[PDB]
Amino acid sequence: SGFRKMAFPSGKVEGCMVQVTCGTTTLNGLWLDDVVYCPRHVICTSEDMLNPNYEDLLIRKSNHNFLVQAGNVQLRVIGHSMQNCVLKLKVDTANPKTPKYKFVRIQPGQTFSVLACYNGSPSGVYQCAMRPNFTIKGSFLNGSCGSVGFNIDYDCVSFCYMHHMELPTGVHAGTDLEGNFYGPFVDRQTAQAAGTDTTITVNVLAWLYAAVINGDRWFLNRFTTTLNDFNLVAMKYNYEPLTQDHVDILGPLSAQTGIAVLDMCASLKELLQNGMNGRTILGSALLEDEFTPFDVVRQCSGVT
Amino acid sequence: SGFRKMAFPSGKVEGCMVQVTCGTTTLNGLWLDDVVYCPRHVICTSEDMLNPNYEDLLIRKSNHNFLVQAGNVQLRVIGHSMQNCVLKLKVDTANPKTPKYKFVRIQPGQTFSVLACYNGSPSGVYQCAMRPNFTIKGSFLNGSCGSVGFNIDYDCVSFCYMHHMELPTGVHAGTDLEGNFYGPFVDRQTAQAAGTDTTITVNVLAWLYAAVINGDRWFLNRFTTTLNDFNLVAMKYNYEPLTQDHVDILGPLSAQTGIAVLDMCASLKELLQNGMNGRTILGSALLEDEFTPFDVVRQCSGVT
Ligand SMILES: CN1CCN(C(=O)Cc2c[nH]c3ncccc23)CC1
Ligand SMILES: CN1CCN(C(=O)Cc2c[nH]c3ncccc23)CC1
């Protein structure tokens, strides 16, 4: 019993973190096999950051300009390339701690763990969601760039995020491990505004199910709704529309609790309309949207 | 920028987790040097759990009755002893992944990371606080016993908690690594009620400072208070009393923000009296009390 914002165990990823220095800038890199992945803005001066031409800046850089340190031992760089917004530094040594891994590009609403790192050393781990506006609400200070987001399936680390920048609103933007930004963001020091940060409705419903499973049931009501009726209310409250694909994904939680998805939607509808009236659900005074239905089943079943 | 409930990187602890089986019960153990630490209730049948005499039950157990598996390799048990509520199984092999470590008994209000484990395998990591009633609000299912709470200082893991049981209210009780329960709890399947779960005032104030540092300032007011005046209000709201030791610990956050501790107390006083009025602080609709002043400085400074 109990329900916590839970991160994946970070050890498999800790074993991949290194320090990358180009000139006076140090940030983090991800060492998998004989490649080190890092944000391309490592090559930029503060001046360059305002309006960088990365291809032109990169011409001035050689393998020996990329200093890669794994613990307190230097790796030899034997190649470099730019893929979208990441640099791939080929090193002469395969990371001996390379886990089974994939690179995945996640959808908005998907959660992942972040291993916040500075100078290639882990500082902490927390759980994030890719927001519907393709930002993440992380905890990142200068030097945290190259920190990675990931999910784990038994022994396979799926890398989904690499940290690149903070927007002037203090929300975070980054890439997949192919170097493609989530959302419309660019690695340039220019004011970039985020769109509407809507609530991840299917995740809220997952968390309401988690609440029921954990004995927090006060919000269960006598009502039902329809997807169309629910969605009118969702749109009014800047909630993402619910689709039958969302209802399908909530099936196992529906079956475990015996609460029809549309009934739980009607409960959610009343919470939106009435608020919490000073009550809490799983120790929260707001509706939590950074647990996926998969997250709730995993936590509630004890997958390792 | 941004402020997250952040756990320590768990890799150093992942390397210590093993599976302990006695008869038909499997739970987790902590392998440090040539000792495996686990809850003594591993020796109990369901029947035994109702009113166990652990010394008498342990007489019936030999070294070869304790099955210790590290990954998928069995460890040879060459000794066993009971220290308070934990068993110490001496094995013939030092854990090669043993980190620098200490055993510490934490105070109520102190935070720690939990590596939730099942069958000696990590499932996830989250941040907890020792509640003033000596419970923790964890996320633990059957098989999670022997999971450990810890803090890390650079390269030294301080182990502070080992999970033993859930109370009928679904809150959690456990021991330090000398086997002494936090609070009045006993490892027996008998109804045990928790006392008042008061709010950790110094932690709320730490988190308000964290909010100011991160640009959430709407709650800063024109008022000040005194420790005695604040404490009258604290007691009314089931907040822990604030002492000058708490004010001392908040000094660095006071200095960083230029907000006198007693001014922040007066802000907190108004939040208690007025509530949040549907507003949030660091994405929370309630006052968060599971960040210590040390946690806030660490996260806000990027210690690795
Ligand atoms: C292209 N350019 C954009 C601006 N940059 C950052 O925002 C880096 C960064 C990521 N998280 C942070 N948190 C606090 C302060 C700075 C950062 C550098 C790269
Ligand atoms: C002395 N006896 C007391 C009762 N026990 C537990 O509560 C073990 C336990 C710890 N977390 C849990 N979460 C869910 C279900 C069970 C547990 C066994 C030991």
Domain boundary among B179, B197, B215: B197
Q: B138 and B213, same structural domain?
A: no
d(CA B147, CA A5): 17
d(CA A100, CA A151): 12
Contact assignment for A118 to B304 by CB distance below 8 Å: yes
Q: Count how many Cα atoms sit within 13 Å of the Cα of residue B198 in the half-sphere of its side chain.
A: 19
How close B297 gets to chain A, by Cα (Å)?
A: 12
Q: A124 and A62, same structural domain?
A: no
d(CA A242, CA A231): 6
d(CA A232, CA A234): 6
Q: How far apart are the first and last CA of chain A?
A: 17
Q: Cα of B165 to ligand 2 centre, how many Å?
A: 4
How close A141 gets to chain B, by Cα (Å)?
A: 6
Closest by Cβ to B9, choosing from A3, A14, A128? A14
Tell me the three state secondary structure of residue B173: strand
Q: B238 and B145, same structural domain?
A: no
Whether A16 contacts A99, CB under 8 Å = yes
d(CA B188, CA B185): 9
d(CA A175, CA A181): 4
Encoding tokens for residue B94? Answer: 């030092």
CA A140-A144-A145 angle, to 5 degrees, is 110
Tell me the three state secondary structure of residue B109: coil
**Domain harbouring A270, CATH code:** 1.10.1840.10
Q: Which residue range forms the structural domain that includes residue B214?
A: 198-301
CB atoms within 10 A of CB A294: 15
d(CA A234, CA A225): 12
Q: A83 and A118, same structural domain?
A: no
Q: What are the beta bridge partners of residue A172?
A: A136, A166
Residue listed under structure tokens 């032109």: A56
Whether B1 contacts A166, CB under 8 Å = yes
The candidate with the shortest Cα–Cα distance to B121, out of A277, A303, A197, is A303
Contact residues of ligand 2, CB 6 A cut-off: A 1; B 41, 49, 140-142, 144-145, 165-166, 187-189
Q: Tell me the H-state helices in B164-259.
A: 201-213, 227-236, 244-257
Encoding tokens for residue A261? Answer: 């998805």
Q: How far is CA A121 from the centre of its chain?
A: 19
Tell me the three state secondary structure of residue B269: helix
List C-alpha distances in Å: B70 to B73, B78, B190: 5, 16, 32
d(CA A49, CA A56): 13
Encoding tokens for residue B128? Answer: 């907890």
Q: Count how many Cα atoms sit within 13 Å of the Cα of residue A251 in the half-sphere of its side chain.
A: 5
Element housing B283 (H / E): none
Domain boundary among A171, A197, A223: A197
Atom of ligand 2 nearest to the CA of B39: 19
Whether A82 contacts A54, CB under 8 Å = yes
Encoding tokens for residue A77? Answer: 């760089």
Name chain A contacts of B275, Cβ cutoff 8 Å: 278
d(CA B11, CA A122): 10
Residue listed under structure tokens 């952040």: B6
Whether B215 contacts B149, CB under 8 Å = no
B17-22 sheet: strands from edge to edge: B73-75, B66-70, B17-22, B25-32, B35-39, B86-91, B77-83
d(CA B134, CA B162): 13
d(CA A304, CA B122): 6
Number of domains in chain B: 3
Q: What 3 state SS string does chain A have?
A: CCCCCCECCCHHHHCCEEEEEECCEEEEEEEECCEEEEEHHHHCCHHHHCCCCHHHHHHCCCHHHEEEEECCEEECEEEEEEECCEEEEEECCCCCCCCEEEECCCCCCCEEEEEEEECCEEEEEEEEECCCCCCECCCCCCCCCCCEEEEEECCEEEEEEEEEEECCCCCEEEECCCCCECCCCCCCCCCCCCCCCCECHHHHHHHHHHHHHCCCCCCCCCCCCCHHHHHHHHHHCCECCCCHHHHHHHHHHHHHHCCCHHHHHHHHHHHHHHCCCCCCECCECCCCCCCCHHHHHHHHHCCC
- Which of B128, B164, B187 gets mutated to test ligand 2 (max ligand atoms within 8 A of its CB)? B164
Q: Read off the amino acid at residue A131.
A: R
Whether B96 contacts B134, CB under 8 Å = no
List C-alpha distances in Å: A20 to A120, A165, A304, B161, B259: 8, 16, 32, 36, 37
The candidate with the shortest Cα–Cα distance to B19, out of B79, B87, B86, B66, is B66
DSSP letter string, B20-78 = EEETTEEEEEEEETTEEEEEGGGG--HHHHTS--HHHHHHT--GGGEEEEETTEEEPEE
Residue listed under structure tokens 């040594």: A93
Whether A50 contacts A188, CB under 8 Å = yes
Encoding tokens for residue A146? Answer: 């190259």
Q: What 3 state SS string does A78-98 have?
A: EEEEEECCEEEEEECCCCCCC
Closest by Cβ to A143, choosing from B7, B116, B302? B302
User: Which residues precede gaps in chain A, with C-N > 2.5 A?
Assistant: none
Contacts of residue A148, Cβ cutoff 8 Å, sequence gap at least 6 = A13, A16, A28, A30, A114, A115, A159, A161, A162, A163, A177
List C-alpha distances in Å: A74 to A15, A63, A69, A92, B239: 15, 13, 4, 11, 51
Whether B282 contacts B4, CB under 8 Å = no
d(CA A266, CA A227): 10
Q: A165: Cβ below 6 Å to ligand 1?
A: yes
d(CA B2, CA B214): 6
Encoding tokens for residue B280? Answer: 């949030």
CB atoms within 10 A of CB B273: 10
List C-alpha distances in Å: A304 to A51, A114, A281, A300, B155: 45, 18, 26, 12, 25
How close A152 gets to chain B, by Cα (Å)?
A: 10
Q: A143 and A8, same structural domain?
A: yes
Domain boundary among B71, B99, B127: B99
Whether A158 contacts A102, CB under 8 Å = yes
CB atoms within 10 A of CB A186: 13
List C-alpha distances in Å: B195 to B112, B167, B192: 21, 12, 10
Burial class (CB in 10 A: 0-12, 13-18, 19+), B247: middle
Which of A8, A69, A139, A167 is most worth mutating to test chain B (most B CB atoms within 10 A of its CB)?
A139
Element housing B270 (H / E): helix B261-274
d(CA A240, CA A242): 6
d(CA B39, CA B56): 16
Q: B179 and B65, same structural domain?
A: no
CA B109-B110-B112 angle, to 5 degrees, is 135
d(CA B241, CA B227): 9
Residues in chain B: 304
Q: B140 and B20, same structural domain?
A: no
d(CA B241, CA B255): 22
Q: B172 and B62, same structural domain?
A: no
Encoding tokens for residue A144? Answer: 């945290």
The candidate with the shortest Cα–Cα distance to B27, out of B52, B48, B44, is B44
Compare all CA atoms of chain A with the CA of B280 and give the residue at the minimum distance: A286
Contacts of residue A131, Cβ cutoff 8 Å, sequence gap at least 6 = A108, A137, A171, A194, A197, A200
Q: B188 and B205, same structural domain?
A: no
Compare all CA atoms of chain A with the CA of B139 and give the residue at the minimum distance: A2
Whether B118 contacts A304, CB under 8 Å = yes
d(CA B112, CA A99): 27
Total beta-carbon pairs less than 8 A apart between chain A and chain B: 155
Contact assignment for B2 to A115 by CB distance below 8 Å: no
Q: A2 and A32, same structural domain?
A: no
Q: A266 and A171, same structural domain?
A: no
Quoted resolution (Å): 1.5
Experimental technique behind these coordinates: X-ray
Closest by Cβ to A138, choosing from B2, B10, B128? B2
d(CA B138, CA B164): 12
Q: Read off the amino acid at residue B171.
A: V
**Domain harbouring B177, CATH code:** 2.40.10.10
Residue listed under structure tokens 């493609």: A180
d(CA B70, CA B15): 9
Going by their DSSP bridges, the two strands A156-166 and A100-103 should be labelled as parallel
Whether A37 contacts A177, CB under 8 Å = yes
Tell me the three state secondary structure of residue B17: strand
Whether B160 contacts B139, CB under 8 Å = no
Q: B125 and B68, same structural domain?
A: no
Instruction: Assess whether A80 carries a catalytic annotation.
Output: no
- Among the listed residues B41, B80, B163, B164, the single catalytic one is B41
CA B66-B72-B73 angle, to 5 degrees, is 60
Q: A188: Cβ below 6 Å to ligand 1?
A: yes
How close A59 gets to chain B, by Cα (Å)?
A: 33
